[PDB]
Write a protein that binds this ligand. Sequence first.
Ligand SMILES: */O=C1\[N]C([N])=NC2=C1N=[C]N2[C]1O[C]([C]OP([O])(=O)OP([O])(=O)OP([O])([O])=O)[C]([O])[C]1[O]
Ligand SMILES: [Zn+2]
Ligand SMILES: [Zn+2]
Ligand SMILES: [Zn+2]
Lengths: 34, 113, 198, 96, 94, 285, 366, 62
Amino acid sequence: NMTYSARIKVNVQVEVFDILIGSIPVMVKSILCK
Amino acid sequence: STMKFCRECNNILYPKEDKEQKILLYACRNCDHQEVADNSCVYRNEVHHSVSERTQILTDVASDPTLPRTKAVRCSKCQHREAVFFQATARGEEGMTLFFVCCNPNCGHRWRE
Amino acid sequence: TEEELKRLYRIQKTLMQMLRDRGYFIADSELTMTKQQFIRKHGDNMKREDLVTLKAKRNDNSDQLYIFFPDEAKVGVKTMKMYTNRMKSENVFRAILVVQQNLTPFARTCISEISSKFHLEVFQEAEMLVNIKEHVLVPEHQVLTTEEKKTLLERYTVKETQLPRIQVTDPIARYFGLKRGQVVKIIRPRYVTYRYVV
Amino acid sequence: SSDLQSRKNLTEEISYGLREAEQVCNKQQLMVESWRDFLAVNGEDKEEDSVSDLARFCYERQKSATLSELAVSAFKDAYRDVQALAYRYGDQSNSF
Amino acid sequence: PLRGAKGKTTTESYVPYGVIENSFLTGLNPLESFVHSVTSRDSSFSGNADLPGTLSRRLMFFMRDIYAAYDGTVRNSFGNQLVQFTYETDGPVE
Amino acid sequence: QREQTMSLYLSEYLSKKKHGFEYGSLEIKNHLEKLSFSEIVSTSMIIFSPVPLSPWVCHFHISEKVLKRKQLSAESVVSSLNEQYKSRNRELKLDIVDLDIQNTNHCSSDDQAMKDDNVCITVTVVEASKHSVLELDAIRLVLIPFLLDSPVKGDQGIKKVNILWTDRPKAPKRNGNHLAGELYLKVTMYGDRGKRNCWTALLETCLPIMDMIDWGRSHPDNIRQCCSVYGIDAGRSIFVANLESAVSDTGKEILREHLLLVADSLSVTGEFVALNAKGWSKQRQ
Amino acid sequence: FIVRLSENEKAEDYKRREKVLTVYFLSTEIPVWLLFFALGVSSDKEAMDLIAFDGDDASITNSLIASIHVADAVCEAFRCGNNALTYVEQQIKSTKFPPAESVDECLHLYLFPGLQSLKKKARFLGYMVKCLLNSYAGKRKCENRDSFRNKRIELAGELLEREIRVHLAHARRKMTRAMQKHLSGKPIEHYLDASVITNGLSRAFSTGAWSHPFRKMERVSGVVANLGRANPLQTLIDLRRTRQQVLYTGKVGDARYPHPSHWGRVCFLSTPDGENCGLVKNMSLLGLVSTQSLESVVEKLFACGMEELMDDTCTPLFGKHKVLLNGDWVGLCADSESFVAELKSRRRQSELPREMEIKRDKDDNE
Amino acid sequence: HATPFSTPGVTEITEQLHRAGFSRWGNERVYNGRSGEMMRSMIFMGPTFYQRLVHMSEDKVK
DNA sequence: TCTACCGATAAGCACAACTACCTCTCC
RNA sequence: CGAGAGGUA
DNA sequence: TTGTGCTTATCGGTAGA
Ligand SMILES: */O=C1\[N]C([N])=NC2=C1N=[C]N2[C]1O[C]([C]OP([O])(=O)OP([O])(=O)OP([O])([O])=O)[C]([O])[C]1[O]
Ligand SMILES: [Zn+2]
Ligand SMILES: [Zn+2]
Ligand SMILES: [Zn+2]
């Protein structure tokens, strides 16, 4: 009774003069599925 | 409904009337050019009653009414009482004459009054 | 202007028929007259003045109603005042006003303020062209008297309120000149029914 | 049907009846005020043009309401006779 | 006419009208089946059923208070209002 | 209601003449049916003719075939246009005093000569020595749309008239019910939103033709205004007839007593109230 | 960009009230002739040549004359100089939320972004006005919502895309608010919220409410449904469905009956009986949904023989048809038949994307 | 094959059923199981494919 | 000479769009 | 306890 | 998405003293 989702990572660089954003549900037999 | 363009300014001309010349002239508001007019015609439109565009199919406007039907006259070739009657001029006669056409699908007979 | 002449002839014929149906002793000469006789006995121009007559009831000679034709349309309060003064002087209690256009609100207030003293009826020329009573759909209407009303109420043991209602503005009520509190007997083509004018 | 020949005869009869019903509908569609000159007993040279344009009648019918209703009524009247063929081509022991 | 406009002056609406020569025993062409489905889509009990119920309710709310009394007259529940003096009763043995 | 369907029955004195009913119905239809002036004119144009005191004149060319079909003439349509202009004269808020219309079979127009059997109608404006009408836009947008909508036959109130045949009319004959057919006419008039009723306006239009229309059976098709015109009983009878017709068309058989009871219950207070809550509240009040 | 043909209400008297052409661009309500002369046009004859009506009608001419007069009365000396540009800039700057860009910048990236040249967009506007006039005259039929030719479907590439975008926007707003509250008075792993998007997606999938394509509020229902395990046929037909969003499904109207465009795409014989009849359509066995193409077909189209669109507005077209790519005018073709035949031949030889439609109609000549 | 838009003709079905040794119209002579007498009219019999729905009688008792 | 009610027409706002049941699935 | 979608007569 | 009412309200719009 849990969610079949995959985490999303993207690098963020802060300039002053890979973090976790969310998990998207994964469809069965998609490009990322066992 | 008749628009023309000046040969020098290539802009729309506006009709006007001259009191001294008593003639029709066309002048544009951008350049001071007054040319002579032809046929003295400033408007021409064919009278058409198609003001309801894309609406005459859904709504029955009844542009062509149906001919009336009567059951008093009796046909000759067949014993059918239903017939359509209307008034129309003859080939050369003057006036309106009442006609009768049998409504029997198997008769197809027409006669005059 | 013969169209106006025949319009006035139809109006006069309908008014005479209504008066005869209401029981005002209308002579057969005024009922069986033709258009040719009507225009021969009229003259050159009537100016809506010769039609002003005075008719009394057949049973009682004291009761009388006078039909008044206004000289012009869009009548105001001066003509109403003159008519009221004439009715007071001649001692008449009923009058019929055959007007051309609709009355003014001031005329309505004037005719409603003095309704208790005298009763007035207003008819349009467009309504008096065809006789309403002479129709296949309109059944026979019979106005009941006080004794008949009392007997009807006593026989069914029912109050006057607990009866079918007919509004005063109905064409039949104005045709018969019915007031509030009078019942009518209707025969349908047998069973009969009664309507209470409210 | 009793056999194959009866079935073929019934099919041909149904086709001819439908064609006759369509012709009757097209004839009935001409009962309008626009054809009063053609319906009169006179000399008109446009008799062939009324029957040459067969596909235009359908378009003229489907664009109108009164014409469509008249066509439906005429088609039902002419199709009653077509429906009346089951008693001729049907047997007494037919369950339907 | 099936392709939008019958050769253009253009058209905006149509009233479909077609005749199917084939029957249900010999089979139906796909265009014939399409025509039949379009024609038969108008048949639905639940598509238009609120109107009879509303009419029945509004008529019952008017007619439920009408009864006949011992005097032979047809009265009303509110104030004993008189509606009909006599019931029609073509056959009066009742 | 906007449709305001009416019903007019023919008189019984037309049976003496052969095919009298058909001729009478056709004459009535030709008399009280609206025919706009736009349906008669084929080409409308404005020509700069230049005391006329009219800088712009309006040309309306009408083919003789249309006039022959509609049984009209140039003088008749000119008189009708003049009568329409002088009757209302409430529109055209311009500095125009009068308006004279001329008739000429042949006009000095060299622009086109495609039709040789088409007459020309010239509309000339009248100006009291001013230049307030010398503009073309105002004329084109006011005078042209005005007279094209002015009817040449019938009145503006009546929209369409059709001839129908019936076997069970709502209004039966006096006593001669032997015949089982009639050729009455159905009249549809524009909804008069004012205090004037459509029946009264129809009575005024039919003044020239009164004896042909049987007024002892003619009744409005509507239920509510019939009660005001002829009385509550006539409206109740028409309501009962319509209810019987609806029941028969529904395919069911219903006894007369139920329909009579419904009709009498819906007209207790002398007025046919609606089936909503407002009608019930008014009836109880 | 909306062009509307309606009567004139601004600076209009009782006598002059007739249909005119108006332009609704950035909520400005500007006349069409001012926009025409602002986009590199300096002659009425050229503007009329651009709008090639090619028909005889009095109403169209009257409407054009009225539009010209309205444009002349709105701005004085609008033909000479840059008065039209100043007027349109003033109209744009008068809005409640005007853009920060100038008149020149707003005419490039906001008005027809697909056309880089300032004169080609004038020709596109002229073509649009010509199409509107032809539709008004009755020579061209209007678009209908029942046909699949004017409808597109989105399963997951755009249905979840807007939800992801709005959740990301909300997360960014929360992050910047937290940064403004925290900077004045830190790793980037704490400012960005990692649970808001997940919770929003979970709520959307559970409650079934989905974001409206055109409205921020008023979430629509019926987008996400459940599956059935009674038989595999039920779960096969549940995965292949199309939903038509109609307000007040009680009165569907025209979008209930099968359309001729449903030939081979959706089943016209099996619809759910009930309130949603006709709204839900089951896809056919030979049904495929086209995806977005990654390669550009401009070079391939130019290689077939298509010529570029003329930059100058003074040179008209004689018989050259119009080539439209995704609603964008990309060039002209001399003969449409041979061009379409060659394009189809190239497509059949695995030289063009297979999910491409080539339409050639002799009515619109494009 | 029973393809919807490619159904075989009725004559083909009748011939196929006739070649199997039965009547061409699908009806066969039956005998009453209660009295043993032979019925006058033949009864049409055939192995049609039926389905069982999820609605049960005991699920509606209230 | 200057209103006092009366009338026609947008306009914006409301209530209403059938019964008796059985299911799942978030709260 | 309500709410949302499907179905039965 | 319409179907009826229902109340403002909004301009004239007539007499009218
Ligand atoms: O919306 C409805 N309102 C209402 N009062 N009754 C109703 C509604 N919807 C369905 N019904 C009831 O259903 C039956 C329909 O009959 P059905 O489909 O069960 O049997 P048949 O004989 O009509 O059709 P088939 O299956 O071919 O044999 C109605 O009677 C109604 O009461
Ligand atoms: Zn110039
Ligand atoms: Zn005959
Ligand atoms: Zn002329």
